[PDB]
């Protein structure tokens, strides 16, 4: 769920996920599709694509078990849609963390830039 | 700081400020600008106008002292910028609560409406 995804993203980035990633670029955030602006944005694109591959579970609302063990996300979750959901989430959290160096707060300003056609998953 | 802001908005409104106010209308939440769509939105605009007037401290980072006395915020903060920043936050919290009457969950969805040109403070 969002809860876990927000948690994981915090856990990896150390950043307030809600302010960093609620709206960012063309792909981070609920409304949002468009050619990735940058690596961060691309993580959210990849993560949205990841969600699309899922069947039988709801990324938004469904809870799943993961742990943080040695400071890394461990999707201990047997149920294999949930495992995949969890793994989508873990992927984006890591991805976002990896891309902190280029994170641009101006890409929060949805009105300060335009979104090209969405990239295809 | 956002810590104190978020607490106050919570205190006043009793709503989760993350779900309610991370993204609302054209002004509430990071990177949002535009003509306020309604009173709640305008609360947020006034609050950024408030921050805009501050010289000498950082509305995001700077912790400050307030108390909740008889379920009203008191900016007991001595230091003059931090107390102003407290008053901004105190004001928005109050404003958001006051305008809960007309709060429109519709305005949470970025792509559901347009933001016209920001008004000037």
Curated annotation (Swiss-Prot), chains A, B:
Arranged from A to Z, the UniProt key words for this protein are: Disulfide bond, Myotoxin, Secreted, Toxin
InterPro entries, alphabetized: PLipase_A2, PLipase_A2_Asp_AS, PLipase_A2_dom, PLipase_A2_dom_sf, PLipase_A2_His_AS
Secreted recorded as keyword: yes
- Which cysteines in this chain are paired by disulphide bridges? 26-115, 28-44, 43-95, 49-121, 50-88, 57-81, 75-86
Which CDD domains does the record cross-reference, listed alphabetically? Answer: PLA2c (cd00125)
* Gene Ontology MF terms in the entry: calcium ion binding; calcium-dependent phospholipase A2 activity; phospholipid binding; toxin activity
A GO biological process of this protein is:
negative regulation of T cell proliferation
Please give the GO cellular component terms listed in this UniProt entry.
Answer: extracellular region
Superkingdom to which the source organism belongs: Eukaryota
Pfam families, from UniProt? Answer: Phospholip_A2_1 (PF00068)
What are the subcellular locations of this protein? Secreted
| Tissue localization of expression | Expressed by the venom gland.
Indicate the family of this protein.
Answer: Belongs to the phospholipase A2 family. Group II subfamily. R49 sub-subfamily.
Q: How does it assemble?
A: Homodimer.
Role description: Snake venom phospholipase A2 homolog that induces myonecrosis, and edema. Has low myotoxic activity.
Q: What is this protein called?
A: Basic phospholipase A2 homolog zhaoermiatoxin
